[PDB]
Amino acid sequence: LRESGPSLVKPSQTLSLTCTLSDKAVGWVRQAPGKALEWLGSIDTGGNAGYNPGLKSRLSITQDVSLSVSTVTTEDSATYYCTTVQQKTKKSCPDGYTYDCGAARRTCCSRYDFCGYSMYARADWDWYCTANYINTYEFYVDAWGQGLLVTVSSASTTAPKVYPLSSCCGSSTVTLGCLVSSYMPEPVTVTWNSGALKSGVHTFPAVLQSSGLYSLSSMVTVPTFTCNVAHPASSTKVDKAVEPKSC
Amino acid sequence: AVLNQPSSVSGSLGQRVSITCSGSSSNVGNGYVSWYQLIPGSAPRTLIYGDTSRASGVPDRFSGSRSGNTATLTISSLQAEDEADYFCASAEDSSSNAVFGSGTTLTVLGQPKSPPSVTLFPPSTEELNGNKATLVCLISDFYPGSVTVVWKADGSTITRNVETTRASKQSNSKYAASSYLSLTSSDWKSKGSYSCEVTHEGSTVTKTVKPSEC
């Protein structure tokens, strides 16, 4: 599964994403930073769509899957997931009425000899039969997407300036890095040699200085090398080379 | 309405852990719960649907159970790659309305202690082509994950302009962290030596850069 959309919207606007065949049921789950999972909405194959009652009023989901939240606030900053849902509602005769009469009568009866009777056809029908049902709901999520973090803020998308990291020439296992400094907001993705270098790579969590700007580094260990930084909020893709010091 | 879960649970490697999920008749009592696992950087993976139906790709070590209004998930033969947040879920008053548990974070103990590797990078020429100087101290490959960091300059502890990130797990299940010293270029060339002191389990590793020899 794959979600796509903007990473930063201003307060009191509408946030719209999209998921990327039609032989499934897709739902949107969101999680604020550190908080718990929060249900938003579902979409079955027939076009119906179930929503959180509290968040229905400011939510919608239409595509030929694309969601939309209204008047977003800082409390809407979350990681929005596209899931593969599998909902199911099962009507069952309220137990006691041991015999489920057919669909023509649409009733449940305590004794089978009352099933061929329409509602209230017999004067004793009320004691042994009813037309109500027990509604039991089953639900889970078949598959998940990676998630797309959307930040709500009045701040402006500042792109990072990437710097290479090399040791002073003062030897047995080389170590290089890339300093992605002063960007906003999160996240950024760092790979090495377009991903051909997967072993010995760690991309550290971000730091926040007093200026409110993020910085993070990615390190690679080796016996040239180019780190690839990408910031979706500023449409920025930098491929800065790390050339070691001569000395 | 929200499903109550313990905040965290821990066990030694190869052992069993259990996590509860206490709701009411409206939600958990009305049918069968669902479980999901969230590892940071990884998409959530469904762990159990129904009361006990094992996931489409989950091994036998994971098990489910339910008695009354509380459901429990079980993880046998603990591994190191099972440190994650686990969420229980079910429906209430609608089959397309879902409610989740408050979440539980699992940690597996007993991994071999490892000392941290430290690399201290000097400012780049391009950053010094403005007039900022950022020293970057990268800590990696340590267990357990709790280090303390002090910065020194000319035999004196630096108090101002230091930021350190909390430790986070790696792909090899050891911990890493970074610390940042943010100066101007004039301050970088002002002093004779800078040191990053990383303390972990009563043992210290120190790396030094000298602005004259870089």
Author numbering:
A (entry chain A): 4 to 23, 29 to 72, 78 to 183, 187 to 239, 246 to 269
B (entry chain B): 2 to 215
Please give the exact wording used by the authors of the publication that reports this structure.
Each of the knob structures starts with the conserved sequence motif [CP(D/E/A)G(Y/W)], in which the initial cysteine residue forms the first disulfide bond with another cysteine residue in the knob, and the motif forms a type I β turn. The compact globular folds of the knobs are maintained primarily by several disulfide bonds, a feature that is similar to the core of other small disulfide rich proteins or domains such as voltage-gated sodium channel antagonist mu-conopeptide, CnIIIC.
The four antibodies with 6 cysteines (BOV-1, BOV-2, BOV-3, BOV-4) used three different cysteine pairing patterns; BOV-1 and BOV-2 used, while BOV-3 used and BOV-4 used pairing patterns. In contrast, in the knobs of antibodies BOV-4 and BOV-3, a two-turn α-helix and a long loop extend from the first and the second of the three antiparallel segments.
